[PDB]
Amino acid sequence: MQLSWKDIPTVAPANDLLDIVLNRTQRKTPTVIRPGFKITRIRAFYMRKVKYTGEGFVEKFEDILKGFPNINDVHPFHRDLMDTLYEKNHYKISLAAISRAKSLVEQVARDYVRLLKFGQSLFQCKQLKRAALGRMATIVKKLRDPLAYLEQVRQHIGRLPSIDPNTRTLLICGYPNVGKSSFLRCITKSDVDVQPYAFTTKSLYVGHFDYKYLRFQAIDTPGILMNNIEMQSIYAIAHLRSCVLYFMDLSEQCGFTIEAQVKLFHSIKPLFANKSVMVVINERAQLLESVKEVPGVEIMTSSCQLEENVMEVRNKACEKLLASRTPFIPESVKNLKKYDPEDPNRRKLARDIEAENGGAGVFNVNLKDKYLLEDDEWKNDVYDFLDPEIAAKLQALEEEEEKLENEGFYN
Amino acid sequence: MRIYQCHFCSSPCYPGHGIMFVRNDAKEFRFCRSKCHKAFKQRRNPRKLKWTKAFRKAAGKELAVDSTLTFAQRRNVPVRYNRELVATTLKAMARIEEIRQKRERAFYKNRMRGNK
Amino acid sequence: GHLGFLPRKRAASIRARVKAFPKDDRSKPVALTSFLGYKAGMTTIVRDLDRPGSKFHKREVVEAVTVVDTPPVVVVGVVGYVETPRGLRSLTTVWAEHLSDEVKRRFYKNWYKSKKKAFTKYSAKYAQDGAGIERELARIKKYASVVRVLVHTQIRKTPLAQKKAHLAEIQLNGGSISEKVDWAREHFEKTVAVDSVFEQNEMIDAIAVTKGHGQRGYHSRTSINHKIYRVGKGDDEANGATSFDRTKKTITPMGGFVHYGEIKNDFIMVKGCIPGNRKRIVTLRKSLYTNTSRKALEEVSLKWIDTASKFGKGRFQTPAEKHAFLKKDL
Amino acid sequence: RISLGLPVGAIMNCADNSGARNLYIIAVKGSGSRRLPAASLGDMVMATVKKGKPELRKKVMPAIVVRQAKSWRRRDGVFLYFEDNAGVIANPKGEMKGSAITGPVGKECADLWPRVASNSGVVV
Amino acid sequence: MATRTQFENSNEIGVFSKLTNTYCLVAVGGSENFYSAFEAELGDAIPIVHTTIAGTRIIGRMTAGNRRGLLVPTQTTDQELQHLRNSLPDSVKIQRVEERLSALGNVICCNDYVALVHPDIDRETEELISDVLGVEVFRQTISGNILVGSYCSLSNQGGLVHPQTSVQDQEELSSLLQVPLVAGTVNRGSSVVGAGMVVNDYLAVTGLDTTAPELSVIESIFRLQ
RNA sequence: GCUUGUGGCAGUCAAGCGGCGACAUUGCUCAUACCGAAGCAGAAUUCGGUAAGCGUCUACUGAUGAUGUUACCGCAAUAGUAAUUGAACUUAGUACGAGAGGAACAGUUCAUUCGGAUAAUUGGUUUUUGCGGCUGUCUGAUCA
Ligand SMILES: [Zn+2]
């Protein structure tokens, strides 16, 4: 499945949903009837309205199931991410209830349509018609609670970032918002709240960048101290192919003790060993030496507010992920200069002269003004006889008639 | 402009007139009028049709080559133009017509030989 | 069917009268607003399309262009109109005292049998300094607000057996109506040319009666937005030539036109096909307004015009070119 | 516009080196409405291969008409017709399958489809 | 130096343009901003002339030429020929061919010193191509492709071939051209490399879809720097 | 002063009506165009309203028939009315957007259908009953 779900249709509230379907049938079906109408016509008239009303409810329920993905069939990563943000049992219950409501609606049509088609009076068909649509309203009316939950999930699930577990990614982890949040914006074009309070980020972020002509996407964790919000990062670390970067501070940011960070690191050590982790830091060496026990980790003292150190860590991370006759050139070519985007004296182009003539489409492209001639002198001026040297050859053509105008037989 | 002469009749085909045929060996074939197109399908030989210049020049009805005619010369080596060349070439056209018309002053009575 | 034209009954007459004229221009110099002519067959033209942004920009294009015979027009009088709550009303009309025999024929059906006693007492009204004529003209200047000129075509100059001049009104434009009527004063018995009323690339519309079919045809139509390409002085030579061809030619095809004679007077080349068959009179009007579009404003660099005989398949544009074609002669 | 000469259901030859012997047309992409709209030179039509690659049984794929064989009016003034009608095989984006195209190819079609012209050697 | 542009939002740069080391040709049409693409990167280095071939916008595919002249199809009009001669330097020869083939850009490929032609072309035109262009001519088919000019792009610095040209095909062809050759794609997998881009000894233009590795490959193989 | 959209049975409560009782209540049984709201970032989209536009003997019509006589030129009371859908350039790969994708206004160019004209040209179309050719029939026979 694709990494985007913004196409899910909106789930209207039960109160609005009930009005939409009932009003839709009324406007799209005939209304004029009299007791003197034919019995067969009356039954057919009511049958179409009942059938149309059932289809309207089915369409919305059918479309809802189509748009909403199955929580346990998308991806092991997205499975938990949706579960953590949208409880699985509630999510399944809402979809299951929608299917049950649709099945009941189908039962409503089968039961009453069969009864209606055998009616013999206008009131019987009319009253039974209300009974047919009466249960549909009751079924939908009691479905208000699950419907509200679906809409809230719909307006939030589609907004979730389109993170791709399959492709290369760079996970960011460490003590809550210790320099890590600002790191993502430095790598590439992305925005993250920089205000340094403990949990500056509540959800995941992605920042795309390219190295070796290959796409990469950096991922920022909400924060790790359990908390349900923190649970999102735990599954991201495990089920994402990446080399996670651990963030710490030594001298400038947050002044926090490295002892707590080192001890907290050992808690995650068993889980994320298969990722070739790296450690970035903004008796101290001895404390880090405990983390250095893992051969696949390194400590990089760096500053998180300049590009030189940002690339130093990133360059190593990128390698880690993948570790798994003569030409003719006129002098005028190099005598000129590369196009200047904003120099007023730059060589103006027809793309700009067109605007001077009122616009692009209105400018009449003139094949003239780029002409090579000995001298123009006009600039505006059977046609095979225009080749030069014909006039000179006329000297061998004047005396042709002298040998045929004085001899009989065409005289 | 510079219309092409019909291959089946040598008659120039002015713009918007005549029909053209495109084959796999296209060598574009132009018919001046429906008669040539229909006649071409019937495999009528130009050397036999008495009313086409192909037969008239081949059969000796009129001359085949002349000094001015050799300069038909649908040249494809253009040179930078000038009004003096254009103006002078206009005089050549008048002389070309004059000499060609002068050449058009005799063979339609030369064939009268033997019928004096 | 199209209810805009139904009922599909007979046209009022062979001649079609212009129901509406250009609104007004009280600042531009006084000039005519319409003209008369005849359907002089049709021809074909080739030109380079200078239209920007087009699929055929700078490429040659073929289009059928109609030619209308528009011999000079002479003014026989003027008509004054005054606004009234019940609509415009004709106040007074005057005449030039020397209406041509063609005009005099227009007022008689059995012209040969009639004594031919055309305008005589009105003609005698010119036997003095114009007191009677001027006074009637003065009230028009004092009272009239819109002035329409009475003019007729020089039918004697057209290859038509009729000889009965077509007479119709043409509305004037310009400010200071005193000058407008004064303009008509100078033109009494004088002739006007199309070159003084139209120009190349100008947009015009023509109104005429469609061809009959012996209930079909014989209806007035006003196909709007027809472009004028060339306004040629038919009396002069090289009317059919072009700047980039510079060979002397005449617009008249070899053998003339089908059911029409040679052209020996002013003519206009118009885009499309003006309604009405050959020999049908057509009245010309200029767009009814100041149309502004790229199609209208685009100029035409005419390249070559077909002038070959239409009575079969043509081969040459002139008998001189036919020399490159004889027992019956020599 | 040009005169139509390929009514729906027509069959003709293939003008490309894709190996197809003949093409069968069942519909015209972007079909108009009124008599069905007959196909013409340069138009894209849904067609199926009658004989040739055996895997193409009852397979419908977009095709581009390169010849019409029906006399039509062209903006260039002259009226002309082709010896025979033929099409080419390409995807909706114009990615020609056959690396080369032979036989007459309409000038309008060549300009309309840049890649088809690139794959045609006997254009015009 | 390599430029990424489009004509009428089309990636086939070589269809609507033809460029050499001494002159540049660009097709006219509904759009006009395509002219400024070359002008911005060329300026006064070489002339840029708006022109059509037989009234078509496929000038790039219908014509072939080199720095010493131009070769145009049999359907070229005198107006275009006369205008082209008067809008180009003196050292640019122009002549029409008389052959069944018409799409010269697809059927023929040439550079400033060597040329490749359809093996089925007549013998007479081979001499004309060499004389007009002053270049060597060899009958060749790139990896069996018959339209050399469409699936192959050549220059003095180097050349490019469509991806099916294996290393064996690249090496054998390199002997004739005596220049490095790379087999790949342009405009994000477009097999028609010749039509997809136009390149010379000092300038290269490719379609918008051209990916970074494709753009770098063109830059490296053609030795832009 | 008929008609459409919201069920049967059973039960709590009550704004009120004077012991009855509204709604809440518990158990099973449009594709087009213009506006307002929508986590509507873009594209696409739903919802609500507006236009109901836009789509899956006699009816009619040809003709004729005192307003001094005729003819020309005019006004208009009145009746009918039409245009419609889609596509290409540019504004665009800009705005927006981590990315994938990706608009709008204005300025231009075309295509389908509908309708009024045209027969310049293309064609179904021949009593050019125009040429050339042919079959039988000629008159004894070149001549038909
Ligand atoms: Zn002929």
Report the chain C residue with the minimal C-alpha distance to residue D111. C55
How distant is the Cα of C232 from the closest Cα of chain D, in angstroms? 24
Please, which residues have CB within 8 angstroms of residue E199's CB and are 6 or more apart in sequence?
E153, E155, E160, E205, E218, E222
- Bridge partners of residue D101, in order along the sequence: D16, D120
The answer to whether C219 and C243 are in contact (CB under 8 A) is: no
- Based on the number of CB atoms within 10 Å of its own CB, is A81 exposed (0-12), middle (13-18) or buried (19 or more)? buried
Q: Give E-chain residues touching D115 at CB under 8 angstroms.
A: 12, 15, 192, 195
Q: What is the resolution of this structure in A?
A: 3.7
Contact between C317 and B33 using a beta-carbon 8 Å cutoff: no
* CA–C1' gap, A225 and F105, in angstroms: 52
Ligand 1 centre and the CA of B18: distance in Å? 9
Determine if residue A178 is labeled as part of a ligand binding site: yes
Handedness of CA A387, A392, A393, A397 (dihedral sign): positive
The answer to whether A347 and A339 are in contact (CB under 8 A) is: yes
CA distances from E31 to A369, A371, C248 (A): 19, 22, 39
Q: Among A326, A333, A363, whose Cβ lies nearest the Cβ of E45?
A: A333
Choose, out of B1, B21, B22, the residue to mutate when testing the contact with D (most D CBs < 10 Å). B22
Interaxial angle between packed helices A88-117 and A122-141, expressed in degrees from 0 to 180 and rounded to the nearest 10: 180
Neighbours of A337 (CB within 10 A): 10
Return the domain boundaries, chain D. Answer: 5-124
How distant is the Cα of C30 from the closest Cα of chain A, in angstroms? 33
Dihedrals φ, ψ of E153, to 5°? -125, 130
> Which residue range(s) make up the domain with B12?
2-65
Determine if residue A344 is labeled as part of a ligand binding site: no
Q: Count Cβ neighbours within 10 Å for each residue of A139-176 and write b for 16 or more, e otherwise.
A: bbeebeebbebbeebbeebeebeebbeeebbbbbbbbb
Kindly state whether C60 is in contact with chain E, defined as any CB-CB distance less than 8 angstroms.
yes
Q: Among B27, B78, B81, whose Cβ lies nearest the Cβ of E94?
A: B78
Which nucleotide is at minimal CA–C1' distance from A111? Answer: F29
C117: DSSP letter: -
Nearest CA among D22, D55, D52, D43 for reference residue D116: D43
Q: Among A327, A347, A360, whose Cβ lies nearest the Cβ of E43?
A: A347
Q: Where are the beta strands (DSSP E) in chain D?
A: 11-14, 22-28, 44-49, 60-65, 72-73, 79-82, 86-89
Contact between E36 and A351 using a beta-carbon 8 Å cutoff: yes
Domain count, chain B: 2
Kindly state whether C56 is in contact with chain E, defined as any CB-CB distance less than 8 angstroms.
yes
Please, which residues have CB within 8 angstroms of residue A336's CB and are 6 or more apart in sequence?
A347, E43, E44, E45
Ligand 1 centre and the CA of C325: distance in Å? 13
C272: DSSP letter: B
Nearest CA among C78, C193, C205 for reference residue C144: C78
Nearest CA among E46, E74, E2, E7 for reference residue E224: E2
d(CA A50, CA A135): 12
Determine if residue A366 is labeled as part of a ligand binding site: no
Q: Which nucleotides of F are covered by protein (CB under 7 A)?
A: 2-8, 29, 38-49, 60-63, 70-77, 80-82, 88-93, 98-100, 106-123
List of domains in chain C: 6-71+193-210+217-328 (2.40.30.10), 72-192 (3.30.1430.10)
How distant is the Cα of A406 from the closest Cα of chain B, in angstroms? 11
Length of chain D in residues, anyone?
Answer: 124
* CA–C1' gap, C224 and F59, in angstroms: 35
Q: Give D-chain residues touching E150 at CB under 8 angstroms.
A: 118-119
d(CA C158, CA C169): 20
Residues B61 and B82 in one domain: no
CA angle centred on A367, ends A365 and A373, rounded to 5° = 155
d(CA A368, CA A370): 5
Beta strand pairing status for C220-221 and C203-209?
antiparallel
Nearest CA among C328, A402, A400, A411 for reference residue B113: A411
List of domains in chain E: 1-225 (3.75.10.10)
CA angle centred on C11, ends C9 and C16, rounded to 5° = 155
Hey, is D79 helix, strand or coil?
Answer: strand
d(CA C203, CA C95): 32
C30: DSSP letter: P
* CA–C1' gap, A133 and F26, in angstroms: 21
From residues 194-223 of C, list those within 7 angstroms of strand F by Cβ: 210-211, 215, 217, 219, 221, 223
From residues 20-49 of E, list those within 7 angstroms of strand F by Cβ: 30-33
The answer to whether E11 and E19 are in contact (CB under 8 A) is: no
Helix-strand-coil split of chain B, %, nearest 5: 35, 10, 55
Q: Give C-chain residues touching A409 at CB under 8 angstroms.
A: none
CA distances from B14 to A288, E75, E150 (A): 94, 17, 36
CB pairs under 8 A between B and E: 28
A182: DSSP letter: H
Kindly state whether E56 is in contact with chain D, defined as any CB-CB distance less than 8 angstroms.
yes
Contact between B2 and A374 using a beta-carbon 8 Å cutoff: no
First to last CA, chain E: 8
Helix residue ranges, H only, chain D: 107-112, 114-118
Amino acid (1-letter code) at residue C79 = V
Experimental method reported for this structure: cryo-EM
Query: Of B22, B44, B65, which residue is a domain's last?
Result: B65
What does CATH list as the number for D5-124? 2.40.150.20
d(CA E147, CA E142): 8
Hey, is C301 helix, strand or coil?
Answer: strand
Nearest CA among A207, A204, A258 for reference residue A230: A204
Nearest CA among E20, E91, E65, A392 for reference residue B80: E91
Residues A411 and A374 in one domain: yes
d(CA A393, CA A390): 5
Ligand 1 centre and the CA of A210: distance in Å? 68
Residues B61 and B73 in one domain: no
Question: How large is the C-alpha radius of gyration of chain C?
Answer: 22
Dihedrals φ, ψ of D90, to 5°? -155, 160
Ligand 1 centre and the CA of B19: distance in Å? 10
Structure tokens at A8: 């899910």
Nearest CA among C123, C183, C119 for reference residue C148: C183
The answer to whether E114 and E177 are in contact (CB under 8 A) is: yes
The answer to whether C78 and C138 are in contact (CB under 8 A) is: no
Neighbours of C235 (CB within 10 A): 14
| Chain B interface, Cβ < 8 Å to C | 1, 11-12, 14-17, 32-35, 90, 100-101, 104, 108-109
* CA–C1' gap, A28 and F30, in angstroms: 10
Contact between E10 and D114 using a beta-carbon 8 Å cutoff: yes
Residues B26 and B37 in one domain: yes
The answer to whether E51 and E85 are in contact (CB under 8 A) is: no
The answer to whether C80 and C42 are in contact (CB under 8 A) is: no
Cβ of residue D1 near strand F, that is under 7 Å? Answer: yes
> Which residue range(s) make up the domain with A343?
325-365
The answer to whether E111 and E69 are in contact (CB under 8 A) is: no
Amino acid (1-letter code) at residue C178 = S
Tell me the DSSP string of E42-89.
HTTSS-EEEE-BTTBS-HHHH-EEETTEEEE-TT--HHHHHHHHHTS-
- Bridge partners of residue E198, in order along the sequence: E205
Give the CB-side neighbour count of residue D98, counting CA atoms within 13 A: 21
Which nucleotide is at minimal CA–C1' distance from A122? Answer: F3
CB pairs under 8 A between A and B: 76
Kindly state whether E195 is in contact with chain D, defined as any CB-CB distance less than 8 angstroms.
yes
d(CA A372, CA E86): 5
